[PDB]
């Protein structure tokens, strides 16, 4: 049983999640299921269908000067566009977490710096199935096999995220669960360089307490779902560590793969 302060915390977090993220899991699983529409997303499964999809995005590609780059680099820069959007939504989501905006501003930066990509890859699972992922707000679907076919190092970006997502999606979380999980990821007291550690730990303790009780009520037949999710948090930290390493390889070896400045700031001296 949840007391009123805990129910209120979970409600504010869930409402903040619904307000700030355009794509969520209920919407994604409607589209992926084909049970609400006979007009499925456009499928990008090879270079021909990539270029076709890119005809819709010509204004964006020309605006950012990438229309003539190699296909893998065009894709990489479109991935960056989605990441920058999601970081922006995650920052608004974070400010809706009671207590977050009251932290030292440098601690807010640190929590976002280390947390955003953990949250991004957790939420990315919602739009992934074993065969590919939704893109462009659910209007296209890019195949896992197409992503594997890109030249190294770009074929190494998404496949470990699909691997994580297939295991994560088997937990059958809904949006109410994911919103608390993401809040817990952001409010992590173990990040490097945090100043007010004890205070952030107490914030996290409250959110993780609500997460645990919520999972016991929402998934009573998956008794150790909360421990399973604590483990997924550790898996995500490792996933992002490896991701940053690959991003560093791309910056040092790929002259056409400029990082958006916001992402450059996130990755700078990260791990």
């Amino acid at each position: 049983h949840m007391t009123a302060d805990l129910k209120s915390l979970a409600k504010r977090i869930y409402e903040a999640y619904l307000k700030n993220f355009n794509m969520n899991k209920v919407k994604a699983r409607v589209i992926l299921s084909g049970k609400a529409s006979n007009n499925p997303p456009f499928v990008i499964h090879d270079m021909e269908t990539l270029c076709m999809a890119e005809k819709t995005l010509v204004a964006k590609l020309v605006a950012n000067g990438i229309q003539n780059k190699e296909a893998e680099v065009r894709i990489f820069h479109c991935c960056q566009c989605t990441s920058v959007e999601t970081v922006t939504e995650l920052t608004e989501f974070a400010k809706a977490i009671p207590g977050f905006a009251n932290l030292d501003l440098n601690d807010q930066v640190t929590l976002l710096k280390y947390g955003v990509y953990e949250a991004i890859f957790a939420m990315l699972s919602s739009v992934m199935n074993k065969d590919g992922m939704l893109v462009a707000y659910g209007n296209g679907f890019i195949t896992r096999e197409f992503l594997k076919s890109l030249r190294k190092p770009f074929c190494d970006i998404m496949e470990p995220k699909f691997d994580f997502a297939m295991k994560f999606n088997a937990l059958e979380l809904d949006d109410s669960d994911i919103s608390l999980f993401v809040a817990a990821i952001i409010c992590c007291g173990d990040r490097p360089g945090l100043l007010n550690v004890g205070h952030i730990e107490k914030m996290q303790e409250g959110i993780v307490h609500v997460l645990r009780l919520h999972l016991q009520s929402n998934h009573p037949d998956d008794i150790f779902l909360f421990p399973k999710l604590l483990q997924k948090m550790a898996d995500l930290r490792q996933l992002v560590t490896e991701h940053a390493q690959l991003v560093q390889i791309i910056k040092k070896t790929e002259s056409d793969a400029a990082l958006h400045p916001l992402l450059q700031e996130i990755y700078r001296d990260m791990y």
Partner: peptide, 12 residues
């Protein structure tokens, strides 16, 4: 900091 700018923005 670009992150600080996002963090200091008024609620939408």
């Amino acid at each position: 900091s670009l992150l600080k700018k996002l963090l200091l923005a008024p609620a939408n």
